[PDB]
Amino acid sequence: AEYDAVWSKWERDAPAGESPGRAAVVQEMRDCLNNGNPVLNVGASGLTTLPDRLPPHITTLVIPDNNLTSLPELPEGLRELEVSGNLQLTSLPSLPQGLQKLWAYNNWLASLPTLPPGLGDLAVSNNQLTSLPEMPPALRELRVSGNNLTSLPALPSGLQKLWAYNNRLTSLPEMSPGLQELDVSHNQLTRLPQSLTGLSSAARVYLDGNPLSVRTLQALRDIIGHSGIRIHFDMAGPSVPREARALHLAVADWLTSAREGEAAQADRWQAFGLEDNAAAFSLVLDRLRETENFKKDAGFKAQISSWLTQLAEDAALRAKTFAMATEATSTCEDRVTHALHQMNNVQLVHNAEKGEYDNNLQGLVSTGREMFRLATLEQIAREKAGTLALVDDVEVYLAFQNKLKESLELTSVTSEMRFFDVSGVTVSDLQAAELQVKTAENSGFSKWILQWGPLHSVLERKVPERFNALREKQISDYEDTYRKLYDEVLKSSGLVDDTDAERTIGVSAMDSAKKEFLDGLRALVDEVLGSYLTARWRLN
């Protein structure tokens, strides 16, 4: 019929040397069209062009070792597509809904079409893939090894085996409970999800070749020794310390927006990368960026990216921020959350110094409470971090912010993810953290705000005369107390001649002044912002 005419010109248009192979395929296609052959296997004829039309009935198509650059629109009846050896094939056509097996290996695919809901076997290994489409519910085998993937999409519950060898994965999604084999060997994974512990006792997990953190390695040893799960990883391999990237490279991966000045700002960070402690700051950016939170919520980028802008304009702030990052890198991890908060505080202190809160004392308290809530969540995050073998402080803390943003009025949190579940953190944990945060805020926010850094900056700007009076009084109270205590030792005929005794008396005198100063600041805070320090949450 009409299909025969299309095949005729395809063979006739074949370049020299291809017509013999092209003609041979036509006979197989004609065989399918006449006697309804369900399988069409194009021979390894080196054909570079495929006919625009093919037998619609065929449910199986195989195209091995051909110099193809594109594929014709597939028939709806296909359930098995196998394309291999087409090193010039960089994309596949629209996948039919009824397709069940998709084998595209030893190709140069850079993108993958929308996966049909019925696909169960996907093999796209040895390709140029950088991102995977959403996995079909019926998928049970996923061959994605030998690609440039950095993230894995949501894994269906029915997935049985997954191979991701020699990829660039930096974070792993929560794993399916019924996963027999999981090969993420030789990737850029620094930590693993807690769902790994939920696999079957006989499951084979291959994690060798990844820059797994020392804490993660210790967790795997305990996991294998207590649950009997077959986990293969590097134990006797030397522990590799993290190598910091150039600061501008790390910042560039955050400033990915199309704003006018984002790209130009990133280039400035080349010079900043030579500043002291830049390596520690670079590591912090990569630690936060290589997370499922970053991969799933663009709001995470909007927060860190805007924060970098202020650091680019304030040298003093940027240097102090870098010094904060040294804490996270001094130990291998688990100090990142504390460093991040101290980076926000220094940022707020400079914002207070700039005078943002000079006429927004109500906003200052609101920011203070929010920082107190975030500070409390840090401690709660650490507590759950120890309980969870494969989860650290950062991942737990991010989950608390995302779920408790509305519960605790955390306006600072730009991430709004409700379907993002971090295994190991149950609803009972969130409610306890939500209750504990509210309990602490009502009980001791007034004490907390006294030592808050931004409050001192704002007080120095809007109540300087009274603020400096307290500071001057502390000097006078210390001097008077020192002379008072100095004489008391003299009456006891104690040691006052030696310098150390004078120093020890000074600390006693200095402590007394600090107690006097703290009480004075408490009264001043109540006078200025006392009305804003009332209990926020109605509790039981």
Residue numbers in the entry: 161 to 700
Paper text:
NELs are found in a number of Gram-negative bacteria, such as the mammalian pathogens Salmonella and Shigella and plant pathogens Ensifer fredii and Ralstonia solanacearum. They are composed of an N-terminal secretion motif, a leucine-rich repeat (LRR) domain, and a C-terminal NEL catalytic domain and are structurally conserved across the family. Crystal structures and mechanistic studies of NELs have provided insight into the activities of the two key functional domains: the LRR domain, which is responsible for substrate recognition, and the NEL domain, which can be divided into two subdomains: the C-terminal subdomain containing the E2–Ub binding domain (E2–UbBD) “thumb" and the N-terminal subdomain, which encompasses the catalytic E3 region containing the active site cysteine. Many pathogenic bacteria contain E3 ligases, most of which structurally resemble their eukaryotic counterparts, yet some bacteria, including Salmonella and Shigella, have evolved a new class of E3 ligases, the novel E3 ligase (NEL) family, that have no structural homology to eukaryotic E3s in their catalytic domain but function via an active site cysteine, analogous to HECT or RBR E3 ligases.
To better understand the mechanism of SspH1 and the apparent differences in activity, we solved the crystal structure of a construct containing the LRR and NEL domains but lacking the first 160 residues, ΔNSspH1 (now referred to as SspH1). The structure was refined at 2.9 Å resolution with one copy in the asymmetric unit and a P622 space group. The structure is elongated with the LRR (residues 161–393) domain extending away from the NEL domain (residues 405–622), which contains the catalytic cysteine (C492) and the α-helices of the E2–UbBD (residues 623–697). The E2–UbBD of SspH1 consists of two long antiparallel α-helices and a small C-terminal helical segment, as also seen in SspH2. In our SspH1 structure, 60 N-terminal residues, those in the LRR–NEL linker and the loop containing the catalytic C492, have a higher B-factor compared with other residues, suggesting more flexibility in these regions.
